[PDB]
Nucleic acid binder design. Structure first.
Ligand code: MG
Ligand code: MG
Ligand code: MG
Ligand code: MG
Ligand code: MG
Ligand code: MG
Ligand code: MG
Ligand code: MG
Ligand code: MG
Ligand code: MG
Ligand code: MG
Ligand code: MG
Ligand code: MG
Ligand code: MG
Ligand code: MG
Ligand code: MG
Ligand code: MG
Ligand code: MG
Ligand code: MG
Ligand code: MG
Ligand code: MG
Ligand code: MG
Ligand code: MG
Ligand code: MG
Ligand code: MG
Ligand code: MG
Ligand code: MG
Ligand code: MG
Ligand code: MG
Ligand code: MG
Ligand code: MG
Ligand code: MG
Ligand code: MG
Ligand code: MG
Ligand code: MG
Ligand code: MG
Ligand code: MG
Ligand code: MG
Ligand code: MG
Ligand code: MG
Ligand code: MG
Ligand code: MG
Ligand code: MG
Ligand code: MG
Ligand code: MG
Ligand code: MG
Ligand code: MG
Ligand code: MG
Ligand code: MG
Ligand code: MG
Ligand code: MG
Ligand code: MG
Ligand code: MG
Ligand code: MG
Ligand code: MG
Ligand code: MG
Ligand code: MG
Ligand code: MG
Ligand code: MG
Ligand code: MG
Ligand code: MG
Ligand code: MG
Ligand code: MG
Ligand code: MG
Ligand code: MG
Ligand code: MG
Ligand code: MG
Ligand code: MG
Ligand code: MG
Ligand code: MG
Ligand code: MG
Ligand code: MG
Ligand code: MG
Ligand code: MG
Ligand code: MG
Ligand code: MG
Ligand code: MG
Ligand code: MG
Ligand code: MG
Ligand code: MG
Ligand code: MG
Ligand code: MG
Ligand code: MG
Ligand code: MG
Ligand code: MG
Ligand code: MG
Ligand code: MG
Ligand code: MG
Ligand code: MG
Ligand code: MG
Ligand code: MG
Ligand code: MG
Ligand code: MG
Ligand code: MG
Ligand code: MG
Ligand code: MG
Ligand code: MG
Ligand code: MG
Ligand code: MG
Ligand code: MG
Ligand code: MG
Ligand code: MG
Ligand code: MG
Ligand code: MG
Ligand code: MG
Ligand code: MG
Ligand code: MG
Ligand code: MG
Ligand code: MG
Ligand code: MG
Ligand code: MG
Ligand code: MG
Ligand code: MG
Ligand code: MG
Ligand code: MG
Ligand code: MG
Ligand code: MG
Ligand code: MG
Ligand code: MG
Ligand code: MG
Ligand code: MG
Ligand code: MG
Ligand code: MG
Ligand code: MG
Ligand code: MG
Ligand code: MG
Ligand code: MG
Ligand code: MG
Ligand code: MG
Ligand code: MG
Ligand code: MG
Ligand code: MG
Ligand code: MG
Ligand code: MG
Ligand code: MG
Ligand code: MG
Ligand code: MG
Ligand code: MG
Ligand code: MG
Ligand code: MG
Ligand code: MG
Ligand code: MG
Ligand code: MG
Length: 74
RNA sequence: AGCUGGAGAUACGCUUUGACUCGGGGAUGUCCGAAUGGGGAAACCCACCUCGUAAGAGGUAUCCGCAAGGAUGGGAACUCAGGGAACUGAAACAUCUCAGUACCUGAAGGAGAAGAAAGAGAAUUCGAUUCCGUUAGUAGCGGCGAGCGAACCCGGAUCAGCCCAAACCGAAACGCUUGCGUUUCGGGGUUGUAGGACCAUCAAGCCGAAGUGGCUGGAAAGCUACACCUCAGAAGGUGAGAGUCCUGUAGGCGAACGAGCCCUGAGUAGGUCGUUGUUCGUGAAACGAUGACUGAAUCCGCGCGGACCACCGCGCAAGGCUAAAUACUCCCAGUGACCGAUAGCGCAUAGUACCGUGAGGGAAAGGUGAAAAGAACCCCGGGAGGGGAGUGAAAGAGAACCUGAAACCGUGGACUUACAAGCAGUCAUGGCACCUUAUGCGUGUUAUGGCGUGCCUAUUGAAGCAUGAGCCGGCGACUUAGACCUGACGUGCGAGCUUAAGUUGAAAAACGGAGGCGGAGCGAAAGCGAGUCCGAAUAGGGCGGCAUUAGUACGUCGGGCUAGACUCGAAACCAGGUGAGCUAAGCAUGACCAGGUUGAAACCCCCGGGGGCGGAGGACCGAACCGGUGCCUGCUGAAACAGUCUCGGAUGAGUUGUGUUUAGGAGUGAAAAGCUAACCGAACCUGGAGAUAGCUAGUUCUCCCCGAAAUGUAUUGAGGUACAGCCUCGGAUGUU
RNA sequence: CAGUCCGCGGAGAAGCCAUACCGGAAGGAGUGGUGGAGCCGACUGAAGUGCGGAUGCCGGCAUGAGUAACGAUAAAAGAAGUGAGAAUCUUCUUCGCCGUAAGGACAAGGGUUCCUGGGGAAGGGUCGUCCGCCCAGGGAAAGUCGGGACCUAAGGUGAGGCCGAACGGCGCAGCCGAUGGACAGCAGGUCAAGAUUCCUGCACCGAUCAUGUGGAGUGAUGGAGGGACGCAUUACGCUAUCCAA
RNA sequence: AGCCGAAGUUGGAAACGCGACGGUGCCAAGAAAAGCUUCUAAACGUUGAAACAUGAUUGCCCGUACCGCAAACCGACACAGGUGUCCGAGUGUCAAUGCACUAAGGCGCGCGAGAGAACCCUCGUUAAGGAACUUUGCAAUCUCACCCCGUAACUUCGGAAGAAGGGGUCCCCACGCUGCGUGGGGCGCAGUGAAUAGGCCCAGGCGACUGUUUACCAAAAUCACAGCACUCUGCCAACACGAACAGUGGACGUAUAGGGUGUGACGCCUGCCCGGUGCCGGAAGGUCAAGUGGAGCGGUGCAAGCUGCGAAAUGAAGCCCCGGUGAACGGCGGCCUAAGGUAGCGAAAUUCCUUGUCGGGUAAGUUCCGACCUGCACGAAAGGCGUAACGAUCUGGGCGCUGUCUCAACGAGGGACUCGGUGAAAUUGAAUUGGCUGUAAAGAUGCGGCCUACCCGUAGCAGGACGAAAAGACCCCGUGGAGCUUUACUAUAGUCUGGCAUUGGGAUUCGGGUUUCUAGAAACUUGGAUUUCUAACCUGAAAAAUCACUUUCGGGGACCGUGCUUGGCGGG
RNA sequence: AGCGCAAAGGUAGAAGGUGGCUUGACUGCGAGACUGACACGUCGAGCAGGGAGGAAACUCGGGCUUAGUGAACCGGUGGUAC
């Protein structure tokens, strides 16, 4: 489970292979030939709180952690 | 005052110092199971620690926390959430739909969710959330196709908003060059018409009014002659139909214990890239929502008003809690133009029997009689079965016990039949029999004469040698839904007509105008308006006048739509499971292969050759065993793949046990698409699911009237559809 | 089926059964016969409302028909018994059939099928007095055999630990897990039915304690050895066991 | 044994069992763990040890009946099927678990009795002939064990080989040797006297071979095989299973190894053609995404400003382009294409015309064999030509013998038939069910005429009932389905690539930024680029196997791995 | 004979041939009919604004006629100001 500690998340979306796009450029107005679902996540770090451990930590959570401890220390 | 479970059976007994039975608590409560001392193939194995006499009792899992003390699992449907189908429609099919449906998984409760505006919205209104009606199929989305589809206003059901961070005091512990600031505790402080600081009853139950004589009968509750009670004539039982026999009902009481109302939230608002929700499919695409990278502002401040800007309005996000109206119905009561033994739940009980290795599938159901009085006794028979006798109203009820239809099997009697050719009959005549709707224009039968291609379906055409069908019974197919559209008929009111949600009553229905339809049309729309669009003015289209054709709320019915949509019927597709106990291989570990034949190296002598010696081999022959080569038999089998005989191997790439691992687009395969539990070019089960079916078959009571078509054009069309053509019903017209 | 009337009914309802009667048809009456407890007629309302068909469904009964067969061509025959009844059950004497089996012992796996006494519906491809069927009652004995209170292979688990939308997927030690390692008795007897279990004879094992010798060193979840392993052939002795006189 | 209890000898045979964990040879190199024996650590003591002897005491749980190659298990059954392990006597026969008889033990298979038709199944003998039968000698003969003698073309020298072919086989006696051999006699038709117990030869095709396969219509020429070849892969290897920086397999292997592909022992060999396609190199130039850039074109405001578009240049892989590669996909012909067939073979498993022509073999040869070549439409590792040996392989021939046949006959048994007991099935519109000829949907019992036919059975046959069975698997149709294919379309796991994050100091060349100063350079970078560094990270060694600690530590290294996004490749 | 291409009709007072002028190869309309199931299609007098030729009557909203063509959706370009 990729739960990135404080603001844990794992997302999925559907994604669209759009054809020869013009849109407001011209008549070719994206035929949409692809409808398939995707996923994504994030990587790993190590931290301390109460007594030190190590946990997956969002890089955005690392950016918050370089500004000061938040509930748990770096 | 009986009790001693169903259970119907005997014996043993308990009870008026209160049994039983009913309500309420207590106390015991073996083992499995979240199972939790440890193991494990549930319900069984093996321990340790304190009590310590012993029999016996208590503790010994993990997660959160010092510590109390929580948690694990289960629950029919309902809720929220993390994932997320495919048939299907689109008459093909990708976007689309089917659908956030089915399904899986998580959390939880009697509900849940959501909820106290950085909102809807366009009146400078509204003031939490949920739910119904409506707005409304309006807006809108859509290969702008099939189709998908809001919200506000308004009307109801229910309506409660409450709490913390933060500026500031008191620290206290700790942090630094010296009356100061990181997270902890009390005070205080909770906002937008900006707020705030600091300075001026129901449970178990009891009581409960009132009828007797005669008659029929086996029996009284029926009939009948006189009565009585009624705050009670709801109902059920009693030998049949009971206000007055019972139990009850109306009414009334009813308990020790019993349940139940200077600050105002940043790694964030915002942005780019990928995406998505509401009607939102990149569309001009705002807004929320998050994966990645970034990254503001403070009250002369921030977000929104659907690209974007100014103005003008709505509102203060990045902290939390919050009943009720709402959903379901495992369970209880009540009720029914609901069923009544093929119906109704699968079950008048049973998730049993039975089928399956499994997941899982899955039945038939019934009836003495009032009461057992359930047939003493005798007869034939081992019986079984039966005949008497009795019981009983009935034994024309006797336990294969209500009725007891049809197929189908028999016994007896009338008429008939052994040179006849035959869809089983139809009319006629004669012969015989009989006379209970019945001496006749008779009933049963019959001889001869004439006549005469089963039924349905599908068809140009059916006796067909075209389909279906053994026969009788019984189940078995044009339905339901909706504030839908359209027509016919009927009714109320009528230039007006009517409610929906709900509210109050219910042995009964009234209120409820939000809202819908008529009243004006033309236009692409702004917009004009009996006129209007086209246009530079005149020519037209739709429209009113005129015939002002009257509408609307219901009911019934004909059609239409949407949804299984007249019933049955696919081969398939998808989801989550169940299966390697068959078979396909692997692994671990054990075991098995009579006997006989041949005689490799190597080693040792005589000159690569001879001798010895030795005992090798995917060597030879042949039993077990493993395997199936050819004929035959078997072919409703002895057997859902065999048997006799014959044949392949038979120390190797061998056979075989146990245990075990590998599976569904997946496994395994010395490779046939072979095997994966007896139908494998994608198992099985449950489900989606009544998939779709332009294809087939089937669609039952009667009579009256009318009466077709197989043509034309169009079509991923030709065996199918659309529009004409032809039929019919009604209205008008009025001889066309 | 429902509402409302009219009524009927143990001197007998519906239902069932005949029937020459009646309406234009779907149909409906009269009378008789079962039946034995509810029901007709009229008006209205609602429907799961009218069957010959669907290789339709549940059910019963036909035809084929007293036909094919009676499940290995290892044959059976006489006496005698029992008995309601015997080609078949019991016994006797011949006969024939298997004999690396068609004998015996185990494992599975089945679960009372075992033994005794009884029974005769149905199951037994005929019969049946019999049975592996029905009824009732007995039989099943372990310190040493197999397993467990020991061990480990594959495999499965698995505190910690590594991962992963969820459920979960892995995963060191340890643990489970026999098909393997380890380990103490044999000979005999016998219920109707048990046997290295019970009884008889005489052994072994471990454990506790006592008496004594000895009269002091024991000596771990750690080290070490060992347990510890293939195939084909093959020499020597021997037993089981069988042959001869 | 026996009528309570006798005897228990001599000779021989002999296990897979015991001694044993024996010897020897081989290569494919053959569990773990506790019990057990021996050591100390800690601890307990060293005048109530370890051990031994005797006595006593203790000995828990579960299983054990019966069936158990089958009437009691798996096959819906009292089922001809299967079912793992152990023991399984004797006579004879070289041997044996074989064959025949039989001990022990066990059983006659749960309808019987007649009869001796057709027909059918398993069988015995058969005149004369002998394959004439037929697709084919399919089937059934024939051959048959042991011993002696004798055996070809060919050969990889091992084999073909049991080649072929001939001879013996029994009983008695004497003699020799360790039951054999030597002589003699004897009996029959006959001497492995009964049972088990190879037919053989010549010549092809295909495959070398043993082997493997479509449970249940195909066992082969299919598949695999050693051998060969290409090609990849430097070790967290390529490669595969996988939500996964998890973990595994490859592999406790490391280029003499591992993966894939195709040929398929051995022998002689394996030619031509890089044009397309693939791939491997190159990478002057063409084109190519996001991103960097934002010159300009517009809105909207009085304006500050906000905001919609938006070029040029610069942007990777990749494709176009240029070489090459064939034991890569392939091509090697039609009165210009990249070339046009090197050897070898050829009427083929490939030959249409086709029974090609000639020869061979038979009286007669569409077959077959050998030559020829006019190869419709051979050919070199989708291998070409051979090959000994091998084959339940296919084809042609010949010997041998046969009821396959001319041509069937007689006999046996199990049915079939008759009687008694039990007693089904597929089917079935209903049947009072004829012949001809005509007619009708065009194949008449059923319509027309004409003929024939008393009622009913029973044993038989197989023409009719378009008989029976499975709503034709062939064909067509359905805007049905599914499996498979590819340069059909679309996506997409996977995979390559640029940029952003994890992700950092620094030197070193900097197209450039600012305040810095006599066109200029120190403080300094925003970056890019090589190069280098060790705190991020990855990885490995040490009593602490996976993991965490520390590491005198060791290596890589801001890459690799992972997150987002870009563009390509992508029948898996 | 000819009539731009295929043929049928038609045509000698021209539709054939040859010059002058110019664009009616117009905008807005459409009475009436033909034809088609629809949907499309054909012919069309005359009115407006304004042109062109002719001295005028008059003739011009394409070619002697019949073929020279594709609804609908989605978009490009110019106007317009809903
Ligand atoms: Mg989602
Ligand atoms: Mg009772
Ligand atoms: Mg437990
Ligand atoms: Mg447990
Ligand atoms: Mg469709
Ligand atoms: Mg589809
Ligand atoms: Mg659901
Ligand atoms: Mg759920
Ligand atoms: Mg829960
Ligand atoms: Mg009276
Ligand atoms: Mg009553
Ligand atoms: Mg976006
Ligand atoms: Mg679109
Ligand atoms: Mg029922
Ligand atoms: Mg019934
Ligand atoms: Mg049920
Ligand atoms: Mg049962
Ligand atoms: Mg009886
Ligand atoms: Mg009676
Ligand atoms: Mg009766
Ligand atoms: Mg009875
Ligand atoms: Mg009754
Ligand atoms: Mg009855
Ligand atoms: Mg006569
Ligand atoms: Mg006749
Ligand atoms: Mg007819
Ligand atoms: Mg026809
Ligand atoms: Mg027919
Ligand atoms: Mg039929
Ligand atoms: Mg509604
Ligand atoms: Mg009306
Ligand atoms: Mg008008
Ligand atoms: Mg109506
Ligand atoms: Mg109608
Ligand atoms: Mg309609
Ligand atoms: Mg269906
Ligand atoms: Mg061999
Ligand atoms: Mg040989
Ligand atoms: Mg096989
Ligand atoms: Mg052979
Ligand atoms: Mg499936
Ligand atoms: Mg696949
Ligand atoms: Mg199968
Ligand atoms: Mg569906
Ligand atoms: Mg048609
Ligand atoms: Mg029509
Ligand atoms: Mg007219
Ligand atoms: Mg009566
Ligand atoms: Mg009647
Ligand atoms: Mg009665
Ligand atoms: Mg009734
Ligand atoms: Mg019905
Ligand atoms: Mg019909
Ligand atoms: Mg029927
Ligand atoms: Mg039936
Ligand atoms: Mg017969
Ligand atoms: Mg018979
Ligand atoms: Mg038989
Ligand atoms: Mg006898
Ligand atoms: Mg006698
Ligand atoms: Mg007697
Ligand atoms: Mg009897
Ligand atoms: Mg006697
Ligand atoms: Mg046996
Ligand atoms: Mg057992
Ligand atoms: Mg017995
Ligand atoms: Mg007995
Ligand atoms: Mg009996
Ligand atoms: Mg019987
Ligand atoms: Mg017997
Ligand atoms: Mg025991
Ligand atoms: Mg003992
Ligand atoms: Mg043991
Ligand atoms: Mg695991
Ligand atoms: Mg084990
Ligand atoms: Mg064992
Ligand atoms: Mg032992
Ligand atoms: Mg005794
Ligand atoms: Mg015994
Ligand atoms: Mg051996
Ligand atoms: Mg003697
Ligand atoms: Mg053995
Ligand atoms: Mg251990
Ligand atoms: Mg026993
Ligand atoms: Mg037992
Ligand atoms: Mg069977
Ligand atoms: Mg059997
Ligand atoms: Mg033996
Ligand atoms: Mg023997
Ligand atoms: Mg012998
Ligand atoms: Mg034998
Ligand atoms: Mg036996
Ligand atoms: Mg017998
Ligand atoms: Mg025979
Ligand atoms: Mg002969
Ligand atoms: Mg001869
Ligand atoms: Mg012939
Ligand atoms: Mg032949
Ligand atoms: Mg053949
Ligand atoms: Mg043969
Ligand atoms: Mg030679
Ligand atoms: Mg030789
Ligand atoms: Mg020979
Ligand atoms: Mg002689
Ligand atoms: Mg002789
Ligand atoms: Mg002999
Ligand atoms: Mg013989
Ligand atoms: Mg071969
Ligand atoms: Mg062989
Ligand atoms: Mg086969
Ligand atoms: Mg075969
Ligand atoms: Mg790793
Ligand atoms: Mg090959
Ligand atoms: Mg030839
Ligand atoms: Mg040939
Ligand atoms: Mg060849
Ligand atoms: Mg010739
Ligand atoms: Mg030839
Ligand atoms: Mg080649
Ligand atoms: Mg080859
Ligand atoms: Mg050979
Ligand atoms: Mg072979
Ligand atoms: Mg031959
Ligand atoms: Mg004969
Ligand atoms: Mg005979
Ligand atoms: Mg008989
Ligand atoms: Mg009988
Ligand atoms: Mg004719
Ligand atoms: Mg005809
Ligand atoms: Mg006739
Ligand atoms: Mg007739
Ligand atoms: Mg026959
Ligand atoms: Mg069909
Ligand atoms: Mg078909
Ligand atoms: Mg298709
Ligand atoms: Mg990808
Ligand atoms: Mg892309
Ligand atoms: Mg495909
Ligand atoms: Mg002219
Ligand atoms: Mg005009
Ligand atoms: Mg004019
Ligand atoms: Mg003029
Ligand atoms: Mg424009």
């Amino acid at each position: 489970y990729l739960t990135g500690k404080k603001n844990l998340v794992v997302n999925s979306v559907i994604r669209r292979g759009k054809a020869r796009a013009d849109g407001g450029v011209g008549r070719k107005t994206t035929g949409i030939t692809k409808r398939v679902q995707r996923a994504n996540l994030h990587k790993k770090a190590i931290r301390e709180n109460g007594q030190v451990k190590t946990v997956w930590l969002s890089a955005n959570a690392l950016r918050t952690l370089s500004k000061g401890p938040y509930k748990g220390i770096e």
